Design an enzyme around this catalytic site. Structure first.
Site, PDB file in Angstrom:
ATOM      1  N   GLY A  72       0.563  -1.348   0.142  1.00 15.91           N
ATOM      2  CA  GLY A  72       0.013  -0.099   0.424  1.00 15.91           C
ATOM      3  C   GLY A  72       1.093   1.157  -0.045  1.00 15.91           C
ATOM      4  O   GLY A  72       2.358   1.192  -0.428  1.00 15.91           O
ATOM      5  N   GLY A 107       1.793   4.731   1.619  1.00 15.67           N
ATOM      6  CA  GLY A 107       0.906   6.005   3.304  1.00 15.67           C
ATOM      7  C   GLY A 107       1.687   7.188   2.737  1.00 15.67           C
ATOM      8  O   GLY A 107       0.263   8.053   2.153  1.00 15.67           O
ATOM      9  N   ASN A 108       1.515   7.727   3.570  1.00 14.10           N
ATOM     10  CA  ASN A 108       1.601   9.309   4.032  1.00 14.10           C
ATOM     11  C   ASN A 108       2.141  10.159   3.275  1.00 14.10           C
ATOM     12  O   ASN A 108       2.071  11.083   1.812  1.00 14.10           O
ATOM     13  CB  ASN A 108       2.586   9.826   5.834  1.00 14.10           C
ATOM     14  CG  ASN A 108       1.332   9.683   6.841  1.00 14.10           C
ATOM     15  OD1 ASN A 108       0.070  10.213   6.650  1.00 14.10           O
ATOM     16  ND2 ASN A 108       1.436   9.496   7.280  1.00 14.10           N
ATOM     17  N   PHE A 109       3.784   9.241   2.815  1.00 14.03           N
ATOM     18  CA  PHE A 109       4.643  10.031   0.850  1.00 14.03           C
ATOM     19  C   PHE A 109       5.141   8.708   0.906  1.00 14.03           C
ATOM     20  O   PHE A 109       4.699   8.755  -0.760  1.00 14.03           O
ATOM     21  CB  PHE A 109       5.738  10.422   2.139  1.00 14.03           C
ATOM     22  CG  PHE A 109       6.759  10.288   3.540  1.00 14.03           C
ATOM     23  CD1 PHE A 109       7.370   9.200   4.098  1.00 14.03           C
ATOM     24  CD2 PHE A 109       6.416  11.475   4.909  1.00 14.03           C
ATOM     25  CE1 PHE A 109       7.100   9.109   5.483  1.00 14.03           C
ATOM     26  CE2 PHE A 109       6.537  11.478   6.141  1.00 14.03           C
ATOM     27  CZ  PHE A 109       7.085   9.723   6.275  1.00 14.03           C
ATOM     28  N   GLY A 110       5.805   8.150   0.979  1.00 14.02           N
ATOM     29  CA  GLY A 110       6.476   7.176   0.660  1.00 14.02           C
ATOM     30  C   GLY A 110       5.399   5.743   0.820  1.00 14.02           C
ATOM     31  O   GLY A 110       4.469   5.718   1.068  1.00 14.02           O
ATOM     32  N   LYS A 164       9.307  -0.009   3.726  1.00 10.15           N
ATOM     33  CA  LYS A 164       9.353   1.229   3.139  1.00 10.15           C
ATOM     34  C   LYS A 164      10.032   1.551   2.459  1.00 10.15           C
ATOM     35  O   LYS A 164      11.240   1.553   2.705  1.00 10.15           O
ATOM     36  CB  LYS A 164       8.940   2.040   4.574  1.00 10.15           C
ATOM     37  CG  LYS A 164       7.915   3.491   3.954  1.00 10.15           C
ATOM     38  CD  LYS A 164       7.513   3.691   4.773  1.00 10.15           C
ATOM     39  CE  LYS A 164       6.955   5.110   5.158  1.00 10.15           C
ATOM     40  NZ  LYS A 164       6.164   6.096   6.232  1.00 10.15           N
ATOM     41  N   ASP A 178      -1.671  10.589  13.137  1.00 12.96           N
ATOM     42  CA  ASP A 178      -2.210   9.798  12.374  1.00 12.96           C
ATOM     43  C   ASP A 178      -2.413   8.312  13.231  1.00 12.96           C
ATOM     44  O   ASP A 178      -3.241   7.292  11.643  1.00 12.96           O
ATOM     45  CB  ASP A 178      -1.312   9.998  11.728  1.00 12.96           C
ATOM     46  CG  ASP A 178      -1.894   8.908  10.006  1.00 12.96           C
ATOM     47  OD1 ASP A 178      -3.205   9.469   9.459  1.00 12.96           O
ATOM     48  OD2 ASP A 178      -1.254   8.741   8.681  1.00 12.96           O
TER      49      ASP A 178
END
Ligand SMILES: NC(=O)c1cnc2[nH]ccc2c1N[C@@H]1[C@@H]2C[C@@H]3C[C@H]1C[C@@](O)(C3)C2
EC number: 2.7.10.2
Length: 283
Positions: free
Chosen positions: A14, A16-19, A40, A129
């Protein structure tokens, strides 16, 4: 300390926030054996690189049952190596297995999110978050907070951290003081926890999610950055997420008390853990 050439791509997990996060086999003997892990990497600015290195350090510094396990890094463009959890996110697990997850089970997860967060507090970390999409399932009995991408350390001297340059945010999980003054605290994590508990009792029906529900109450005709304004004003006027279908009074009260405009009145994770446990022991 993990060798790039030894990480074997299996599938995407999936974004995430950035990568993004991938499933790989770590196979340094280059036989068939070797554990599967989650990797990640950034999709990468300097600002993001700085944050990613903070994220790694945060995750390295955490040892808890209800926090995803750090395993190492991979240098050559940084890679974070984590335990892979085969049941996936709580939002997915709950949707897949909704028919065998009763309220007791939901409060067991709730309780575990509380413990992990109480532990975050002792290290003066702010998650920022908390959402069911960010919680992972280890087995039918245990959940783990993942994604520490937006997490901040409180400076030794202040009880809130103001976030410079707020990018596109999870606005529907944000406390009012976070939306107005970009101010993040144990109290704002407590607010967000309140939304997480709301998510659980809706069992993630599409139309019952926090975004669908606030857009209902604002009007589907409202658009752009007006959305945030209307949300701030709605919260100022004590507008709130409705009691989920099947959610008892006692449980809704935890949520509404988490969603207090007054920062200091919001309960502690210590209180939330104990209160949840008793309501659980009351069935
Ligand atoms: N250990 C892990 O990071 C991890 C382990 N097993 C997993 N199985 C499915 C996703 C997943 C993991 N991370 C996912 C990644 C980042 C964040 C949290 C997860 C779901 C998300 O949507 C948002 C994408």
């Amino acid at each position: 300390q993990f060798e790039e050439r030894h990480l074997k791509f299996l599938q995407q997990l999936g974004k995430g926030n950035f990568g993004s996060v991938e499933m790989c086999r770590y196979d340094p003997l280059q036989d068939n054996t070797g554990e599967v892990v989650a990797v990640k990497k950034l999709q990468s600015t300097e600002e993001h690189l700085r944050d990613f290195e903070r994220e790694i350090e945060i995750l390295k510094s955490l040892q808890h049952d209800n926090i995803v396990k750090y395993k190492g890094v991979c240098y050559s463009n940084l890679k974070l190596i984590m335990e892979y959890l085969p049941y996936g996110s709580l939002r997915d697990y709950l949707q897949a297995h909704a028919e065998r997850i009763d309220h007791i089970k939901l409060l067991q997860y709730t309780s575990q999110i509380c413990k992990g967060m109480e532990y975050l507090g002792t290290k003066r970390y702010i998650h920022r978050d908390l959402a069911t999409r960010n919680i992972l399932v280890e087995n039918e009995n245990r959940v783990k907070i993942g994604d520490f991408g937006l997490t901040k350390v409180l400076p030794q001297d202040k009880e809130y951290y103001k976030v410079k340059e707020p990018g596109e945010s999870p606005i529907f999980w944000y406390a009012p003081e976070s939306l107005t003054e970009s101010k993040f605290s144990v109290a704002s994590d407590v607010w967000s926890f309140g939304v997480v508990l709301y998510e659980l009792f809706t069992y993630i029906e599409k139309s019952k999610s926090p975004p669908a529900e606030f857009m209902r109450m604002i009007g589907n005709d409202k658009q752009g950055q007006m959305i945030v304004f209307h949300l701030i004003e709605l919260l100022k006027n004590n507008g709130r997420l409705p009691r989920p279908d099947g959610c008892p009074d006692e449980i809704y009260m935890i949520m509404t008390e988490c969603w207090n405009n007054n920062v200091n009145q919001r309960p502690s994770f210590r209180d939330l853990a104990l209160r949840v446990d008793q309501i659980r022991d009351n069935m």
